């Protein structure tokens, strides 16, 4: 029916 | 006040250098008022109420994808002048309109009617 949320990840302002 | 854009998306939380999606699935929609001001609102799907509502001027923000963790649909709103960044993830089952929504978001936040 609906998609599951993504897993946590590291974000870097490149 | 018709909505310029609207799609299922949830908010995320960025702390330090880690982005974690919030299970509080919401809806990202845009509407222009009689003031010619584009309103960027994020409503929670839980109650269907508008949790957030901020007016976004042209060239004031940038809607783009986040190529950090490929797997799903993650977009970030970069306030060019607000110096603030927001994280969102698409909850729609199909992305057949993801690009369009993404394009409309930028066109409505950078190119108001």
């Amino acid at each position: 029916q609906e998609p599951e949320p993504p897993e946590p990840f590291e974000y870097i302002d490149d | 006040n018709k909505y310029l854009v609207e799609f299922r998306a949830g908010k995320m939380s960025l702390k330090g250098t880690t982005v974690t999606p919030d299970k509080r699935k919401g809806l990202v929609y845009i509407q222009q008022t009689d003031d010619s001001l584009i309103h960027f609102c994020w409503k929670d799907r839980t109650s269907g109420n508008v949790e957030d509502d901020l007016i976004i001027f042209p060239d004031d923000c940038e809607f783009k994808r986040v190529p950090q963790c490929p797997s799903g649909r993650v977009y970030v709103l970069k306030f060019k002048a607000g110096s603030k960044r927001l994280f969102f993830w698409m909850q729609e089952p199909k992305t057949d309109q993801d690009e369009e929504h993404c394009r409309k978001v930028n066109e409505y936040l950078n190119n108001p009617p």
Partner: protein, 76 residues
């Protein structure tokens, strides 16, 4: 900490202001540089409209910050 005020016509107006300065004070500066009263003048920044008593630092308004100036009806 001056700030650039972009009008609806695209006319930008830089006004020397301080972070601690309130929004009300800033609006007055616009009046002197244009003549727009607070009632007709609506300063918006950070994607959100400014309150009044709030300070510029409250909205993270730094120098050369481009503030959005919204004008109400001109009687027509």
């Amino acid at each position: 900490m001056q700030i650039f005020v972009k009008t609806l016509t695209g006319k930008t107006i830089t006004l020397e202001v301080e972070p601690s300065d309130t929004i009300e004070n800033v609006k007055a500066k616009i009046q002197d540089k244009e003549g727009i009263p607070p009632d007709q003048q609506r300063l918006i920044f950070a994607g959100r409209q400014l309150e009044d008593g709030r300070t510029l630092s409250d909205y993270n308004i730094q120098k050369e910050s481009t503030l959005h100036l919204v004008l109400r009806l001109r009687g027509g």
